[PDB]
Design a protein around this ligand. Structure first.
Ligand code: HEM
Length: 152
């Protein structure tokens, strides 16, 4: 649960992401893949990427980064009222993609990392606190659907 002030910060920070959704999406995925190589194995269409240079050069990775952050932004803009939006994502990630919740923790931290990297000094303490809570909420609601499905 976030306060309205906190949601306001989240959506303020998100305005930064939306000015360049593909650049942000790209850097998030790269941070995930390089920080946690086992995650790369879950993508049949990225598993070929051996080096970070190849990742940076991949237009399809940038494309998918856009898809991911477009979906996350859709969800964030609901300010917690995201059941309809989140349920299909939980179900596809549990049943088709088979993504353990640990990896959603990974990408959550990666988003925080990227925001500091692209906006040093422009991502204050309050903003980090709000974004972190929002990603925890997102993660926690997915976690509930995972439990329901018996997925580890
Ligand atoms: C903020 C977190 C995430 C969001 C918003 C998100 C969103 C999406 C969306 C919208 C799709 C396409 C529709 C679908 O298949 O349901 C997708 C596909 C996929 N996601 Fe996620 N995702 C997230 C995190 C992750 C993580 C952490 C992993 C793995 C470590 C992952 C693995 C995949 C894979 C393997 C696909 C299918 C890719 C393909 O073959 O086209 N996702 N994701």
């Amino acid at each position: 649960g976030l306060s309205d002030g906190e949601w306001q910060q989240v959506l303020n920070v998100w305005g930064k992401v939306e000015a360049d959704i593909a650049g942000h999406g790209q850097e998030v995925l790269i941070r995930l893949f390089t920080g946690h190589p086992e995650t790369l194995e879950k993508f049949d269409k990225f598993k070929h990427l051996k080096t970070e240079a190849e990742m940076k050069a991949s237009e399809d990775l940038k494309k998918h980064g856009t898809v991911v952050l477009t979906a996350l932004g859709g969800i964030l803009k609901k300010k917690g009222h995201h059941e309809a939006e989140l349920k299909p994502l939980a179900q596809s990630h549990a049943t088709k993609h088979k993504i353990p919740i640990k990896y959603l923790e990974f990408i959550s931290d990666a988003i925080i990392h990227v925001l500091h990297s692209k906006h040093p000094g422009d991502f204050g303490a309050d903003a980090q606190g709000a974004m972190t809570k929002a990603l925890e909420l997102f993660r926690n609601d997915i976690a509930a659907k995972y439990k329901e499905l018996g997925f580890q």
